[PDB]
Amino acid sequence: SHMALLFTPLELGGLRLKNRLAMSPMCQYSATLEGEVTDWHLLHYPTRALGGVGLILVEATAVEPLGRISPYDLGIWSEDHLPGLKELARRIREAGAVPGIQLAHAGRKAGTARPWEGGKPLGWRVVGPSPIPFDEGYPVPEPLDEAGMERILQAFVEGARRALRAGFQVIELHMAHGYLLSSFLSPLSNQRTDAYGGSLENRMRFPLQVAQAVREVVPRELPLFVRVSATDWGEGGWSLEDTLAFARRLKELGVDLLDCSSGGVVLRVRIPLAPGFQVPFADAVRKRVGLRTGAVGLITTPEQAETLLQAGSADLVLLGRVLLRDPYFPLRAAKALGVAPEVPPQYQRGF
């Protein structure tokens, strides 16, 4: 118990996080029909900020109303989102955690019901690289034109500055899980004939353009995250080695960190699920490309998070479903590693 990296400060860009634990973005589908933050978020996120994560990335917030996953996703497309979003960042920061947010566009997977309300397509005019339905039941995606694509690119750009204006000091771009920019990367969803399809370089283009545009509007001090599905898991698709080329180019545009996810591009696919099953993607990127990486995927234990950080597999450990069932897990993880957690004075007698 002479040491603990999980609760050693992590320096990204120009701020220092109290530890190496972050909350993975997780949609609560509790926003308004116009996408405003509601009372639910103002208890959900601030609770987990008191839970001790150094960083909270609140759920995927769509930069276009029809780029939303569900009708009740958070939004950042209108300047009337700032009041609700501004207070969200304020009540997260007050609780102790740095507030960061994920900018997203659901692409051909846009317009789904709530997971507990069915999760059935609603019939929106979804967009995407090529006109291939995500699966049976989904609207036939509309191949996006550069005019369109510039609108999305500028939706991510204005969406980011809107997030910064709200106080969010970390921005993650959703380029995973078969959503818009992930759809452009994996060949299971993009068989485009233009300069944004065919070759690997062409298919990484639009995505890499969005990354460039956002980098320009985010100051150096604030780290720019990018979440990517490191593999689609279906053959003739996005491979691990393809990601290292993609990761190389993002590190080279100035992106500060990677969040290594997987899957989502298609359904007829098998994923090797296990504790830390996506860690090999974070490890490969960090060591073979030199870009900071974030590990996620059934990370549920203090010792497991600490071990992959010790092993140099990642710089930041993101927690998802563990923080839904256990919001104050990070506080107890610190005490489970011989580290005194900086707990609120009202709770100091509870530790």
Binding window for Cl ion (CB under 5 A); candidates: 93-101, 144-152, 222-230, 309-317: 144-152
Own/partner contacts of 128-133, CB < 8 Å, gap of 24 or more, are: 128/180, 128/183, 128/189, 128/190, 129/183, 129/184, 129/189, 129/190, 129/192, 129/196, 129/197, 129/206, 130/189, 130/190, 130/191, 130/192, 130/197, 132/108, 132/189, 132/191, 133/108
Q: Does 205 bind Cl ion (CB under 5 A)?
A: no
For residues 66 and 54, what is the distance between their CA atoms, to the nearest angstrom? 32
298 is in an annotated binding site: yes
Question: Using the rule CB under 5 A, which residue among 145, 201, 241, 252 binds Na ion?
Answer: 145
Nearest CB to ligand W3X, comparing residues 20 and 177: 177
Does 24 appear as a known binding residue?
A: yes
For residue 56, the cross-strand partners are 23, 99
Residues in the chain: 351
Strand 74-75 relative to strand 127-128, pairing: unpaired
Q: Which residue of the chain is nearest Na ion when measured via CB?
A: 148
Cβ-based nearer residue to a second copy, 187 or 327 = 327
Catalytically active residues are: 179
Q: Is 227 annotated as a binding residue?
A: yes
Of the candidates 9, 14, 115, 338, which one interacts with ligand W3X according to CB under 6 A? 115
Q: First and final CA of the chain: distance in angstroms?
A: 17
Instruction: Report, in Å, the least distance between residue 179 CB and Cl ion.
Output: 18
User: What does the alpha-carbon distance between residue 127 and residue 273 come to, in Å, rounded to a whole number?
Assistant: 30
Q: How far is the CB of 182 from Na ion (least distance, A)?
A: 18
- d(C-alpha 105, C-alpha 260), whole Å: 18
Residue 280 Cβ, how far from Cl ion at the closest point, in Å?
33
Among 67, 141, 264, 330, binds ligand W3X (CB under 6 A): 264
- Kindly provide the residue ranges of all beta strands, DSSP E only, lying in 186-306, ordered along the sequence: 224-229, 257-261, 293-295
Annotated binding-site residue? 177: yes
Residues 294-323 binding Na ion (CB under 5 A) are none
Which helix (H) or strand (E) is 66 found in, with range? none
Residue 3 or 245: the one with the smaller Cβ distance to a second copy is: 3
- 82 CB-near residues (< 8 Å, 6+ apart): 162, 165, 166
State the nearest-atom distance from the C-beta of 199 to a second copy, in Å.
28
Q: Compose the 11-30 pattern: x for residues touching ligand W3X by CB under 6 A, - for all others.
A: ----------------x---
297 carries a ligand binding annotation? yes
In the complex, the residues that contact ligand W3X under the rule CB under 6 A are 27, 60, 69, 115, 177, 264, 349
Provide the annotated binding site: 24-25, 27, 60, 102, 174, 177, 227, 297-298, 320-321, 349
